[PDB]
Symmetry: C3
Subunit: 369 residues, 3 copies
């Protein structure tokens, strides 16, 4: 059965503030394929908090969602709170009509999504709120559906659920293309130097917090760009070295300028999860920030590190770029070599973390940079 | 009406600990000038938490504060909790005599200020506690007063209200004066190089958390110094580059030493908000910390970055300094040029964040550095 | 008397989540030697939270623990919650039989320790849980015992009790031994250069959070290694400079490679407090991470800085190492000098902070690096 832990609105408002205004599944509530048929969808036992209301699923099958008539549609399996309903106290013992497990389309879910609307809202308070758990694609009549967990709505970062690391990676090596401007691939694939003449695309360890960011879905941007899912002040840390950096040989060392920048772009709307409307940034918002700017120093390998705080908005693209001159005999930080003999990033890594919010006055005051 | 949400002392102690022992206005409670007259002061509806007690202002005018007889005095408009009073339950419905909106002078507010005293204190528990909302300067009889919001007591940094960013800025460029020791202007105005021969004072984007820090009010120190409002272990991050750095030309490169330091000074008492007594640091406390120390390397532009954790105390001045030699032909990191042709900081930025507390044993153990 | 604040299991689960699942003493509850005899152990008044249950000790002696028959044994003084017991409501006023102050051996404490087991556990829920306060060594009959506070179970880092700084130090100088690989001493003693020919072991200011880390007890590793007490994603920040770094003199500058790495090692089991079993890391976990890798640049002093996030596991050794070549005429970053004339780390400091957890899926996804 779908049970309420503390189902009242005042205590919910207090627990929501204690959860840092984040809602989500605390434990279990995953799909049970062994108990799922063509007319029912089974979900395992678990606990969830939705805008300060504790929801519990009580053993096989733990709970069953009626899927009769559902076919040839992609739907969202949602956990919903409806305060217009009444919890029946039969047996002085509670049915919980204020809690539902249902199927919704994307526009309906967006209109009542906890991330964008609230039961405790000041300007537009709601009586109905929902949390999406899975994308469920119902096939032809008589089949079992396919599904895709909505990881952003599952808490498992726990002590500071709305903040913390958004993305991080292990050290990696990446060949620098012979161009003026290029992105640094932050999404798990680098063009690794492997021999004196060649580099090859190689996976490296990377992790993203789906509540805070996701990989860009576009072919041109998937290796390099993150989509920011939550507004905030973020901290970006980078560290690494430039190996086989170019310079003019003493004939004094002729250094070559380069910079590593972080960048944001909000030109494309609806990149956030569910195609949600982006949050428009304040007038005069930054788009490019120098993290490291200097000249090559005449050494085989030169280290760098930088830490900055930056504002990012729901729907933004975030990326890192390496910039230098294109004349290898005069102004380029890169040389004419390939593989390990060519200029490359070595032991490069980054962490992106959400460290502050942009609510109230901070939007205009802290949000422009 | 002034309403209490959960007005009992045990649940208040729990909510206060959940608020990270911070009190303040959560929403609204700003001045309503359209409903303010010569005999009344109007305040808009809102919610506030004072040492774990929820206070609510319930529509125009939402609440009215009697200002009869108030003239030719600067006062503090405060929200107060008096546990000696009794909440009248008339109409089995509550008046809330334990909550007041009143005018206090600075010494009285300091004697019962939530930041320095508590209703739940172990050594000296109080029955009366207050939160200042505005400075109100009452003019001559028959006029409306002037006012200045006390932003430190307004929450709008929310998930970690007692911690988070204290100050941060965007990248800026700043000309290095031809002196051995100088402060780096961290308060929003830099001496920006603008031509081959000149620099000009230019604003850059900066933000301060008024709960954690404020700009020094003294003319000599206003461009450079912060006043720390809250004790703690802070993290200072800096990044930038030294452009047109001086060095002896090969005739080998003759590098020139420089350092960037952060500094604290507590010589001046009562710099904290309301002229509150500073918190004296432990014996042997640090005053100067090297963030970057090295020689110029022979390049046009040389990048740096540093991250340190440091103890800071309520009432302290905090600042950053650039130090180098003064003989340009031998030991100075600066040259004999002006504007963009002179040594300057380029793409310089910083973040100061409160990351830990100095309560209990940590005062002596972690507070000296 | 031993009093319960809110002694019900649902509200305990909520307060435990608000405490970031940390249990411990909030105030007092220290040993009272003036009221301690050969048959009784006195403890001072205080407040503690154990898995969301508030425990209070109510004035001299505040509480007395019977020590009759205790002799010639090292025991653990523990505060225990037993939900199998019943709180007697005599005098319509509560005795609190569900709370005990007792002596336990290490295996019994480990079997019911709050850090490893829970009253609210999903897979193995418990009815008995304990928090160790002191090691108590009872001597020969008729004597008073010796004791050692268990600081990890005392909260006094308060707003984010499960996270925050694990270890930090002030700037220090350390002579680089003429070897290929060496650890950097992070535990409070450095080999400080003091003259043109000598260095001497000198204390520097350091602080550790006993909940998160401790000094390695082994002679060979005590100057250099931390023992991690809590799993998590940690942030390591380092900054400093390499002074009197070696290089081949122009006859072009012949730079010399060096790196500073952080390292983890879990070969030795039971290093965690009480000899608790280490938490085994995921398959393919990192052991060495480059923080700074570059060549010496021809300057007297060269600065560096690095920030990385890394996974660490309960029971791990954590340390920092400096690596370079051993041929001073060709590949070593160190020279042939001693004291201030020899290559050394200058103004070196670090902070290690716990920034994320490794619960659920994050163990496999974020835990390998
Ligand atoms: Cs709470
Ligand atoms: Cs069906
Ligand atoms: Cs259908
Ligand atoms: Cs699936
Ligand atoms: Cs996406
Ligand atoms: Cs008046
Ligand atoms: Cs007056
Ligand atoms: Cs005003
Ligand atoms: Cs000030
Ligand atoms: Cs940092
Ligand atoms: Cs005895
Ligand atoms: Cs015994
Ligand atoms: Cs002792
Ligand atoms: Cs130890």
């Amino acid at each position: 059965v779908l049970k309420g832990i503390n189902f009242p609105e005042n205590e919910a408002s207090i627990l929501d503030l204690a959860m840092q205004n984040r809602s989500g599944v605390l434990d279990g509530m995953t799909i049970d394929i062994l108990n799922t048929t063509s007319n029912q969808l089974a979900l395992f036992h678990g606990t969830a908090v939705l805008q300060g209301y504790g929801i519990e699923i009580t053993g096989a099958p733990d709970v069953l969602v009626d899927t009769t008539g559902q076919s040839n549609e992609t739907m969202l399996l949602c956990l919903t709170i409806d305060l217009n309903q009444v919890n029946v106290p039969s047996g002085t013992a509670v049915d919980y009509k204020q809690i539902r497990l249902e199927f919704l389309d994307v526009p309906t879910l967006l209109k009542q999504y906890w991330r964008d609307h609230s039961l405790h809202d000041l300007i537009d308070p709601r009586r109905v709120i929902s949390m999406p758990l899975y994308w469920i694609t119902f096939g032809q009549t008589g089949t079992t559906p396919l599904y895709e967990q909505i990881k952003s709505n599952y808490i498992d970062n726990s002590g500071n659920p709305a903040y913390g690391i958004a993305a991080r990676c292990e050290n990696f090596n990446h060949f620098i293309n012979k161009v003026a401007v290029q992105s640094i691939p932050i999404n798990g694939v680098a063009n690794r130097p492997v021999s004196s003449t060649a580099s090859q695309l190689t996976n490296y360890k990377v992790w993203r917090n789906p509540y805070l960011c996701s990989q860009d879905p576009r072919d041109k941007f998937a290796p390099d760009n993150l989509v920011i899912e939550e507004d905030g002040i973020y901290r970006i840390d980078i560290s690494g070295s430039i190996n086989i950096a170019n310079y003019t040989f003493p004939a004094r060392v002729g250094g070559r300028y380069f910079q590593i920048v972080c960048a944001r772009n909000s030109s494309a709307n609806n990149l956030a999860e569910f195609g949600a409307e982006q949050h428009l940034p304040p007038s005069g918002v930054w788009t490019r920030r120098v993290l490291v700017g200097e000249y090559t120093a005449g050494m085989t390998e030169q280290a760098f590190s930088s830490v900055a705080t930056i504002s990012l908005f729901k729907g933004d693209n975030f990326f890192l770029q390496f910039e230098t001159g294109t004349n290898t005999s005069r102004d380029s930080a890169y040389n004419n070599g390939y593989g390990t003999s060519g200029t490359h990033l070595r032991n490069f890594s980054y962490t992106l973390e959400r460290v502050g919010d942009l609510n109230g006055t901070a939007y205009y005051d802290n949000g422009t940079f």
